[PDB]
Design a protein around this nucleic acid. Structure first.
Ligand SMILES: [Zn+2]
Ligand SMILES: [Zn+2]
Length: 431
RNA sequence: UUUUU
């Protein structure tokens, strides 16, 4: 049995790993590259898509399913297994990819063709290919997210996919993986733990209470797939102690995802399922408004607070959020709250450096608004959680992380008496 | 830590 990394090697985007065992070739994920590597989505896979027997997708995020349609575009016609939630979410993520894609590398037909081969596979259901046995494990990173357990030829492999931050409340706790001969694991936060969640929430509530009281605007850059909805959940469960204010989910995509959530009730934590059982959607706080078009979106830039605005891009790389920052950063009564990681080198990092004035949309703008960074909202297991999940595993191969981050985790794993390496692109690893 | 008017 062997596993060949074909993305997310010494980097975070591009997840796709070819499992060679049981007499078959199974591709684990097939995400796109994002950021500076984006052009690479136009380059070849490094393997023959027509020679793939099946595909399993851990979760709906673009860096795990973005290249799936290129796979079909290039001949693949086999099944693609994923949980119903991933299937449902993927549809939304793929349609959006088409629209907002600079230089596309697949077309609408490649997408309908890809979605056409999706077959449901839920946690605790074994898939059988030749002498290979595959199952999904609970990852707690997104609704329907999972890690993969592959057993064949007398050996056991586990592919973590992306693990969640078990401290948060929306998703259920990640399951522990089975004891394996090899674990291909992510290490996004290999260098450090996250600030405790409960502590992050209180600080979050304090910032909102303070800002909305003085009639200011609370600007929140958010990702449309789970982050935004998680914020609303907090607003619903604790907003009772906040001054009255409209909450604008200024993201059509986050809107579509929100609408889908009630259909995915069983994929959330017991806490969230219990709310739904009482007929109460915990993702819809009082004052929730979903902004569909540009006109109303821009109108918010000139309308006074108090208000809470949720918008993308979550990493400030374009989107309505920029327009809100352009017109709201100059007012000291407002507040910019980051609830997700900002890649060093980008606009977020600059803002956080607190310079006298940052440049947005081709223009310098004074930075008077207060700024906060709540990494505690992260959707990835922090180093400490990564260490707990990996506990007792003889061998670990690290992917999905910046080289330094992966090294930091590796150092600790090696010191713990566990064999570890940083996966290399195309370099098969025996299981 | 991944699309977005
Ligand atoms: Zn993810
Ligand atoms: Zn990922």
């Amino acid at each position: 049995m062997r596993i060949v990394p074909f993305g997310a090697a010494r980097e975070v985007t591009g997840s796709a790993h070819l499992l060679l065992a049981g007499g078959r070739r199974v591709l684990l994920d097939c995400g796109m590259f994002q950021g500076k590597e984006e052009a690479r989505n136009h380059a070849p896979f490094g393997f023959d898509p027509k020679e793939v027997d099946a595909v399993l997708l851990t979760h709906a995020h673009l860096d795990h399913v973005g290249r799936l349609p290129k796979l079909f575009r290039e001949g693949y016609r086999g099944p693609v297994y994923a949980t119903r939630a991933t299937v449902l979410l993927m549809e939304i993520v793929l349609e959006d990819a088409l629209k907002v894609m600079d230089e596309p590398f697949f077309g609408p037909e490649d997408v309908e063709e890809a979605l056409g081969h999706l077959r449901p596979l839920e946690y605790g259901e074994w898939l059988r290919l030749g002498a290979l046995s595959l199952a999904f494990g609970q990852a707690g990173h997104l609704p329907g997210s999972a890690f993969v357990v592959a057993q064949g030829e007398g050996r056991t492999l586990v592919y973590s996919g992306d693990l969640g931050n078990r401290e948060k409340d929306v998703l259920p706790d990640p399951s522990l993986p089975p004891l394996a001969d090899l674990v291909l694991a992510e290490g996004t936060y290999g260098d450090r733990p996250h600030r405790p969640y409960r502590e992050t929430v209180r600080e979050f509530l304090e910032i909102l209470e303070k800002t909305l009281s003085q009639g200011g605007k609370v600007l929140i850059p958010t990702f449309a797939v789970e982050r935004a909805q998680e914020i609303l959940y907090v607003l619903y469960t604790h907003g009772h102690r906040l001054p009255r204010a409209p909450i604008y989910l200024d993201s059509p995509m986050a809107g579509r995802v929100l609408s889908l959530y009630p259909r995915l009730v069983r994929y959330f934590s017991e806490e969230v399922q219990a709310h739904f059982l009482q007929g109460k959607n915990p993702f819809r706080p009082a004052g929730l408004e979903v902004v569909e078009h540009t006109e109303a979106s821009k109108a918010l830039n000139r309308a006074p607070g108090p208000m809470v605005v949720l918008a993308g891009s979550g990493m400030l790389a374009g989107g309505r959020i920029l327009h809100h920052l352009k017109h709201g950063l100059s007012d000291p009564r407002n507040a910019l709250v980051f609830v997700g990681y900002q890649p060093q080198g980008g606009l977020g990092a600059e803002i956080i450096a607190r310079p006298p004035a940052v440049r947005i949309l081709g223009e310098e703008v004074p930075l008077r608004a207060s700024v906060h960074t709540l990494g505690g909202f992260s959707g990835h297991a922090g180093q400490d959680e990564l260490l707990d999940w990996l506990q007792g595993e003889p061998r670990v191969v690290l992917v999905h992380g910046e080289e330094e981050k992966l090294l930091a985790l590796g150092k600790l794993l090696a010191l713990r008496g566990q064999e570890v390496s940083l996966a290399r692109f195309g370099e098969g690893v025996p299981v």
